[PDB]
Design a protein around this nucleic acid. Sequence first.
RNA 1: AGAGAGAG
Length: 378
Amino acid sequence: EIVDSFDDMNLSESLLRGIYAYGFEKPSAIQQRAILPCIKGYDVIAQAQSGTGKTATFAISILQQIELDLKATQALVLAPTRELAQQIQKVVMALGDYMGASCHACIGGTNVRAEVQKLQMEAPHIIVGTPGRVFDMLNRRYLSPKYIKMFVLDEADEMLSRGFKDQIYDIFQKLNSNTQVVLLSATMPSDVLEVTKKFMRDPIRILVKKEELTLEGIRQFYINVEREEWKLDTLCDLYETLTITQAVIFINTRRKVDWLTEKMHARDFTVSAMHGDMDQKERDVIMREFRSGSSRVLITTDLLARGIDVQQVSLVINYDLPTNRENYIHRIGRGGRFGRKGVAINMVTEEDKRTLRDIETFYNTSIEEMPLNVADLI
RNA sequence: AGAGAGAG
Ligand SMILES: COc1ccc([C@@]23Oc4cc(OC)cc(OC)c4[C@@]24NC(C)=N[C@@]4(O)[C@H](C(=O)N(C)OC)[C@H]3c2ccccc2)cc1
Ligand SMILES: Nc1ncnc2c1ncn2[C@@H]1O[C@H](COP(=O)(O)OP(=O)(O)NP(=O)(O)O)[C@@H](O)[C@H]1O
Ligand SMILES: [Mg+2]
């Protein structure tokens, strides 16, 4: 039930070569618990702290199950955003590099004719996608579910939310009745867990109490801003005060991302911005330029709150507080990846500091006032 | 009715 070495998981030699080439050495806590029941075919609900390696948990399990000589799609992974799907596809391709497993991204904002021409010719072993384009390709029969034996929902509690649950159900109805289902997330509320009883067969539950989700390496602070009209000057002050690797600044609406980005540019501050109403060509460039370090400060919506992994991010600023409790955990988790040291700063008006106290109580955490004029907080 | 989530 606990297997502390990749060497003891009965993985193929090519899969192990790919794991070690990517730079892993020992499995994370969640990997030691969840890879083997997934390989064995059990329905699994896998929860673990942000940044602990849930991607490779399902990636390694899918790869080990692939029948390489079967030229058909055998596994389908869904993610809530295009950026997250693209990121998962790269991890899966890297881990399976020595196996020649094929992994295809089925995501919106890409040219449909080009995808259709690829899928008319080849049946990728592994599909990583977003729900809209996946449902589209299933309806037009360019993706076949005939041999899909593994269905993975990353960020599963978001995928089973009001906005996505019906999309996931529509896709699920296309799949064979015997398909294995694997769910992963940092957050798994009891109401989402009840929805899983409707479609998962007596799953293995690896769950983490909410009071244990917060990372020790992510120091959480708040700043009394009192008035919303004062947030902009506070941000500008934090730009000049704080030591700057890379930072993500979260905003609750696309409209306000656009507003804030213009305000910062007018004041000669260098920032980039991304949200879901931008052309996908622009999203791809912005994401690429943040990954490379060309841009160090990104203003974004919850488009980038879940799953995105930029190791150099050490600072998250909640310029708007998240209304949703679960979202708070995902946001601050963009800093402090795989045990790195991070800071999260919450900007709080009078009306916000209630919402803040409820977050503190729910997660049994403590959020401290940010020191004055301290450049290096943690 | 936030954020995302095919297409045109
Ligand atoms: C027939 O093939 C499809 C494929 C995809 C889609 C959809 O994919 C979307 C993705 C989007 O990304 C920006 C936007 C978007 O609409 C503005 C849609 C949808 N297009 C339309 C017209 N309606 C949608 O909103 C669908 C939806 O959720 N509802 C409640 O309407 C049924 C949605 C969907 C349904 C099942 C499974 C996955 C996704 C509908 C029908
Ligand atoms: N065994 C491992 N050894 C070293 N690094 C690892 C290992 N497993 C995963 N990582 C790295 O850990 C980082 C976070 O992995 P990722 O899979 O994005 O985390 P996660 O659990 O899905 N986080 P989140 O989606 O926000 O809940 C990545 O940079 C991985 O490459
Ligand atoms: Mg993840």
